[PDB]
Every structure is written in C-alpha cells, then in structure tokens.
C-alpha cells in the first residue's frame, strides 16, 4: 500500500513534470519522499528514487526564496547520491551520476561553479565508467560542463568540453548509419555556445 501509493505518486509527479505544473510535481514528491523516509528510514535506499525526483522538482521550482529551494534540493540530491553510491549495480551508479548531474546544476544556479564543475566531473566519471562510447548522456554532461566553465571564466576549458560533447553527437552519428534529425538541430545550440565562449 505505501509502496503502491508512493510509486504512482512518483508517476503522477513526473506526469506533472510533463504537464508543466511545477509545484504539483514538487508536492507529489514531498509526500512520496515523506512516505518512504517515514517507513524505511531516511537512510534506506528505497527512498533514493523519490529522493532524486524530490530534489529534481525543487530545482525546477526555483524559478527571492530560491536559495531555500536550493537548500532542500541540494540535500535530497545528496541523500540520493549516497544512497546510490552505496549500491554497486549499473543502475544505481548511473543514478548517482544523474544525482551528480542535478547536484552540479543545483550549483550553477547557486553560482557555486567550483562545486558545479566538480559534480559534472563526477557524473562524467560514472557515466564514462559505465556507458558506451556513443551514448548521448556523455554529450548531456560535456555540454553542461563546458557552460559551467564558461560561467567560471574558464573559457578555453569550456570550448574543449563543448567539442567533446559535439563529437559525442557526431560519432553516434556513425552507428546511427549502419534520431539523426534530433542531433542536427541541437548542434546549433552548441556551436553558438562555442563561438561565444572564448569570444569572452
């Protein structure tokens, strides 16, 4: 019953994450995470997935009480990150990678870049650890990492991350031969970021 209601609450929550309703998503996760931590304990890993999505909606809701949302989003992402860092499976580790991704993005909006690049460097370590050479998640993080650098005035290092990201797209554009439209139109986003990065 608790396990049953919680899983759909996570469903309806991400279904508010498509709907565009941010607070509703946030509260779907609050109680969901509330039910899990109150049943299994705040240490238990069965809280992790709800913990992640909880810390995920609060980040979206952060857009002048933003830092407060930054607090709780950081905590839940940090709780989920160690819940996953414990489990030695592929899924949980990549979930800790995703947790590190969001942690890093929680830092750039926090304008805490030094830690942001770190969490992106951490997410990349675990993705690289596990994913394959032509996986779109590597470009999901190289890109992110380049901008965070740009935000930190490390413009040369920023461009390089961008290049690794675009190359991740181009190389998967080879086995896709023997989503091609989808890659074509998000390449302009990165080239614009490239031309602007060291331009400063």
């Amino acid at each position: 019953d608790v396990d049953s209601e919680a899983k759909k609450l996570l469903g309806l929550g991400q279904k508010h994450l498509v709907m565009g309703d941010i607070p509703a998503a946030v509260n779907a996760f609050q109680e969901a995470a509330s039910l899990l931590g109150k049943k299994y304990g705040e240490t238990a890993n069965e809280c992790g997935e709800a913990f992640f999505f909880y810390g995920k909606s609060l980040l979206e809701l952060a857009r002048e009480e933003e830092i407060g949302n930054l607090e709780l989003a950081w905590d839940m992402l940090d709780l989920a990150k160690i819940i996953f860092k414990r489990q030695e499976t592929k899924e949980a580790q990549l979930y800790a990678a995703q947790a590190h991704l969001k942690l890093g993005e929680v830092s750039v909006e926090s304008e805490n870049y030094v830690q942001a690049v770190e969490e992106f460097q951490s997410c990349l370590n675990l993705q690289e650890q596990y994913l394959e050479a032509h996986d779109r998640l590597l470009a999901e993080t190289h890109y992110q990492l380049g901008l965070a650098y740009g935000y930190n005035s490390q413009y040369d290092e920023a461009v390089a991350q961008f290049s690794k990201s675009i190359e991740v797209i181009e190389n998967r554009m080879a086995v896709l031969n023997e989503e091609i439209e989808e890659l074509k139109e998000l390449l302009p986003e990165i080239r614009e970021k490239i031309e602007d990065a060291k331009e400063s």
Binding site: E118, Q121, S122, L124, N125, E128, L138, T141, H142
Partner: protein
C-alpha cells in the same frame, strides 16, 4: 607568540569541513588545517609577490594572484 597569529577561526574550519561532507573531526584537525593552509599561503604569496616584482608593481593585486594560482595546480574528479 607572533608565530601563533592565525587567519582562520575554529568556527570557519568546521564550517568548511561540513560543507565537504565531513561529519566529525578529531581535536588535532584545527592545527593540521591551520598548518597546511599556511603552507598554501606561503606557496601562493611567494608567486604573486614574485610576479609583483616581475610586473614591477608595488600595490600587487589579484591579477598577479590568479596567475600565481594557475601555477599551483587544478584537481578534477576524473579524466573527461
């Protein structure tokens, strides 16, 4: 006593610790923390002041410092 002058309080030290995920510290942390920082500042001050004499400045500013720290070393959590 002059060699005992400090630049960071004990409150700050535990603050910096917990934000790196540290949960508890031993009593000797405060000295070690203060010991290694001095070294850091030693290594840094020298370079920035060096460039102040290299840039032949007197009121040395950050523009020296940041070059003096790009000279110190950047630790990242992976290879990508």
């Amino acid at each position: 006593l002059r060699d005992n002058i400090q630049g960071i309080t004990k409150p700050a030290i535990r603050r910096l610790a917990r934000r790196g995920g540290v949960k508890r510290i031993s009593g000797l942390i405060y000295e070690e923390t203060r010991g290694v920082l001095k070294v850091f500042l030693e290594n840094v001050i020298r370079d920035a002041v060096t460039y102040t004499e290299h840039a032949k400045r007197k009121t040395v500013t950050a523009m020296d410092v940041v070059y003096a720290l790009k000279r110190q070393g950047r630790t990242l959590y992976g290879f990508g």
